[PDB]
Design a protein around this nucleic acid. Structure first.
Ligand SMILES: Nc1c(C(=O)NCc2ccc(F)cc2F)c(=O)n(O)c2ncc(CCS(=O)(=O)c3ccccc3)cc12
Ligand SMILES: Nc1c(C(=O)NCc2ccc(F)cc2F)c(=O)n(O)c2ncc(CCS(=O)(=O)c3ccccc3)cc12
Ligand SMILES: [Mg+2]
Ligand SMILES: [Mg+2]
Ligand SMILES: [Mg+2]
Ligand SMILES: [Mg+2]
Ligand SMILES: [Mg+2]
Ligand SMILES: [Mg+2]
Ligand SMILES: [Zn+2]
Ligand SMILES: [Zn+2]
Lengths: 182, 367, 367, 182
DNA sequence: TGCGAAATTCCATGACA
DNA sequence: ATTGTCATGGAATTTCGCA
DNA sequence: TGCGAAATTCCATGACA
DNA sequence: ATTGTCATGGAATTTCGCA
């Protein structure tokens, strides 16, 4: 069998609804399966339109062979099926109520949820401007298994933003107070 | 009078050759040279004669001399003519240079992706969805290009676009020309916050941004072809042009910009499959070898009459946007430092220190 | 299928080398070449494959081939690629030429004064006494120049000025570019009434009016110098510039335009007195000898990759004022007649006969 | 003594007042002494201003060493003396009531008067437009003495407008009828 | 160890306002 | 304190297929 | 029949929108 | 049915002044 490579399989999913941030409510998460590299796109809804708009930006940089997702409405629509067929993208779906991807991707989506939650508290309407630094943090995070960051596996070089001071990712006691109040 | 008095009676003065007869006629000293009988004016009158002849049409060396030689002769006339040409301010700042710039430098290709971005604006273009301009961002090592449509070539549209771009990676250096969008303090603030060094071209010299300028040509050329026989609706085509050019082979390199950035083609038409059996680490090892071994051009031969700058030399900067019937050159300035054979610092006509390309300089004539 | 069927079982087909093993896999004919395993498509699929690869970014020969070679191999691929490049209309009309024009002609200097005038307009300039333009009239043989200020580059201002000029003498020929003032029927009427043949440059090629264009440079350069540190009040200076340039020596000729026209200087500063003892008939005899023996340049060497036009060749005229994101070249046209190595008649894109300079032509690529 | 040359001596004089022709009433006549070449300039008055204006056009083509004239007011003014001194032109005056120049110039001014009169009759307000063809006729007229036209002596070539059909210059009987009526 | 043709490399040309 | 670039297609050169 | 310096000629460069 | 041109100042070459 052939070794796993970047652009073989993008894993997509929606996070939301979130509090409004400059008119945006959701985040389309795209994770490359091999490298673990993450792209994040803010959208106003979990619709096919918003997915096609966000993925058109991504697919003007690089096109995946396969897109994997759960059976969410936006991904199972025939409009998204025609969009994928035009670009030669095979669509792949997990069984309903059994979302399965891969250990590296599961742990990556876990990091994204917790990293967002830690920065949502205190400034819950300002996450649109923080999406760039969130991606840089995720993509320059060390991988225990592969022993390389997503940035290193995708580009084959060290980064100019190494996040050496690893964030705790858990919430402090004071951040639980303002989180439980809201 | 004193020098010319000894000449008439027959004594020898240096400069005046002995074999000609110097006589007096109509109160003026003359001499019978092969061209004809010419007047020898005294030393004190000669600067005025050269100035009168020159100022007729502000002529150069030979054209000025041919006027003076119709009436006069004296030792080393062209030396006195060249002396006045170097003092005529109008000629120094109006006349053209007849010495070419020295041969161009071909700076080293940046070693890694995201070491140096080159950014620039295209436009204005025909309105498309209310957009008039395109921000072009070219990675120096790979040539991988990002395109962003904007409504103006502004700092706010540049910051908006680069925040989306830098979601993928931060560059060490961003090179740009001295356009208003890039020279603003708001942009310098944005770059310092992210650890990005802003590098600027010498003024009025797009060759220095040549990496992105050359990419602008391909962007416009492909847009032109796709819009043949159609209205110029280019906003929708920028994603297509971006993807198409990033996956286009450079014949001399044998690689596409996508391949130089990622080391493997994505799911695009005619994707390369030569590294299908290699692991990613084996693939990235081959990519690092490919990046270092790319073709790089060398400095071409100098033209036969080029000049290279020297410290202390009198040079003149080209006027940027010269008005009608106004000089094309500034007043003479001095070369303080030679940064490279093509770039110098000068003591500006205002008094400031100014870093300029020698393409916008001429060496002041007549020393 | 038919050609590829015999290939699989082992028979020889011309073009396909014998030393490689051609096998079937996944319903497709393949071959194990040193670069890798490539698919051999049937003859009927190849034109579509080349077109798909080319249309990605409308790439030239090598960049298109490198895409096709990632997946496919067949005999003489570049021949099929070049075949499609010559049929792609978008590439033919958008791409640049990489062949320079042949070396410039240096036409003979007119034999006599008033054989050929070269006329042209300078402007618009800063308003001076309500005047914005300058009509420049250069005698081809002598270089003697007449200057007239006008409010517009119009036929009526041209006729007014030339009626005053032709009080001194009528010329045989008047050369001009295809500007509106000179191409009007009112001007052709004015010229036919006086026995003057109107000669016109090829369109969009000021080199052809180079005699007067070069004189425009000297007119503007002297005006610039005289107006340094002053408001641009150039109307009063035109008589001064006219007289100054007409009495300025050309170093290569050793004569002023005044001297070539009259054979004797007038009462101007530094007037030449070499023919003071000759009669006028002796003076005019020496003038006729000087006029015939003037220096004349020759055609320079051709650049290493120039082209010269041939009858029947496919060529493309440059678009005059091309809009943004629109092609720089017209559709291919045919060379009817070769007037000289630098000038041709073509069967225009509209259908007309058009006389053009080869500087505004490229040879259509890929035959 | 030195042989006579062009630009040695311009002879100037006014003809007028004439009937109005596009606002002009007089003609400044300039004749080169050696060649016989003639320049004609229309003016609104025989003033120093009109002379200086017309001669500034001529002296931007060629400057004479000497200008000769009668003692007319415009030529004897100190403004015209300063104008001539600035250009290095020596002014030369004939004695009052004894206008003397040279045989060639006298016969040339005679031709100009008679050639104008012959074209004035019939169209007396249209002489402004005819001044170009009048000059060409005068300057391409054969000289009995020198056996060359003024054009030939000035430029050293044949002309593109040779006036081979020599005009009679005298008035016909019908032209005397319309002349004597006015 | 050498030939004819195909494939590859060379590089002048021109345009990015 | 900074610096030209590179797609293009005929031509020149090298490699291929075969002997 | 030869030297050093002055004078002359050569010509690449650039700009005429 | 039409076509580049020529001032400019360092450099290269020739001529001059003297022996
Ligand atoms: N004129 C500009 C060009 C241009 O002329 N390109 C043609 C060109 C010619 C030769 C070459 F080799 C490549 C090449 F692209 C340009 O490309 N850019 O991007 C500009 N960007 C901004 C401004 C605004 C005034 S500025 O003072 O900021 C300044 C002046 C000149 C340059 C840069 C910045 C002008 C230009
Ligand atoms: N653009 C014109 C130039 C010009 O660009 N000169 C720059 C130049 C460049 C190179 C060179 F070697 C010499 C040179 F002077 C020009 O000089 N003139 O006189 C023009 N006269 C009229 C018109 C109007 C449109 S046209 O269709 O009548 C037409 C277009 C082009 C040329 C002539 C006539 C334009 C121009
Ligand atoms: Mg989901
Ligand atoms: Mg710019
Ligand atoms: Mg630019
Ligand atoms: Mg014109
Ligand atoms: Mg012009
Ligand atoms: Mg009188
Ligand atoms: Zn000057
Ligand atoms: Zn094409």
């Amino acid at each position: 069998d052939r070794p796993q490579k970047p652009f073989d399989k993008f894993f997509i999913d929606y996070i939301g609804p979130l509090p409004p941030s400059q008119g945006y409510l959701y985040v389309l998460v795209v994770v490359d399966g091999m490298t673990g590299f993450t792209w994040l796109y803010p959208t106003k809804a979990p619709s096919t339109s918003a997915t096609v708009k966000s993925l058109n930006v991504l697919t003007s940089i690089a096109i995946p062979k396969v897109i994997h997702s759960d059976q969410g409405a936006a991904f199972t629509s025939s409009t998204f099926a025609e969009w994928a067929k035009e670009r030669g993208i095979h669509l792949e779906f997990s069984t309903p109520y059994h979302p399965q991807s891969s250990g590296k991707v599961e742990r990556k989506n876990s990091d994204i949820k917790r990293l967002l939650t830690k920065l949502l508290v205190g400034r819950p309407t300002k996450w649109y401007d923080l999406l760039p630094v969130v991606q840089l943090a995720l993509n320059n995070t060390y991988s225990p298994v592969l022993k390389y960051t997503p940035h290193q596996l995708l580009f084959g070089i060290d980064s100019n933003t190494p996040f050496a001071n690893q964030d705790t990712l858990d919430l402090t006691r004071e951040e639980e107070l303002s989180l439980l109040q809201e | 009078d004193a020098e010319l008095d000894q000449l008439l009676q027959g004594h020898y003065i240096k400069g005046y050759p002995k074999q000609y007869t110097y006589f007096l006629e109509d109160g003026k000293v003359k001499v019978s040279r092969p061209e004809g009988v010419k007047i020898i004016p005294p030393q004190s009158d000669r600067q005025k004669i050269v100035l009168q002849a020159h100022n007729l049409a502000h002529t150069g060396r030979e054209a000025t001399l041919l006027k003076i030689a119709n009436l006069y002769w004296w030792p080393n006339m062209r030396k006195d003519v060249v002396k006045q040409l170097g003092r005529c301010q109008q000629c120094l700042i109006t006349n053209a240079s007849n010495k070419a710039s020295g041969p161009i430098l071909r700076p080293d290709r940046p070693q890694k992706p995201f070491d140096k971005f080159f950014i620039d604006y295209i436009g204005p273009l025909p309105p498309s969805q209310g957009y008039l301009y395109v921000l072009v961002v070219v990675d120096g090592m790979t040539g991988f290009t990002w395109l962003y449509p904007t409504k103006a070539p502004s700092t706010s549209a540049t910051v908006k676009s680069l925040n989306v771009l830098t979601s993928i990676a931060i560059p060490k250096v961003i090179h740009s020309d001295q356009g208003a969008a890039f020279t603003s303090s708001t942009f310098a603030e944005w770059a310092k916050e992210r650890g990005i060094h802003l590098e600027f071209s010498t003024p009025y010299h797009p060759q220095s941004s040549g990496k992105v300028e050359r990419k602008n040509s391909d962007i416009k050329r492909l847009l032109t072809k796709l819009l043949v026989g159609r209205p110029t609706k280019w906003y929708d085509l920028l994603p297509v042009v971006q993807l198409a050019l990033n996956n286009t082979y450079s014949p001399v390199l044998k690689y596409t910009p996508h391949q130089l950035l990622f080391g493997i083609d994505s799911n695009t038409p005619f994707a390369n499959q030569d590294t299908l059996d290699l692991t990613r680490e084996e693939e990235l090892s081959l990519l690092q070898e490919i990046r270092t071994s790319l073709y790089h051009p060398s400095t071409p031969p100098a033209s036969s009459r080029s000049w290279s700058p020297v410290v202390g030399q009198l040079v003149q900067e080209r006027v940027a946007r010269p008005a009608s019937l106004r000089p094309r050159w500034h007043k003479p300035s001095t070369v303080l430092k030679v940064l490279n054979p093509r770039t110098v610092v000068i003591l500006d006509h205002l008094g400031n220190n100014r870093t300029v390309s020698i393409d916008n300089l001429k060496p002041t004539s007549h020393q």
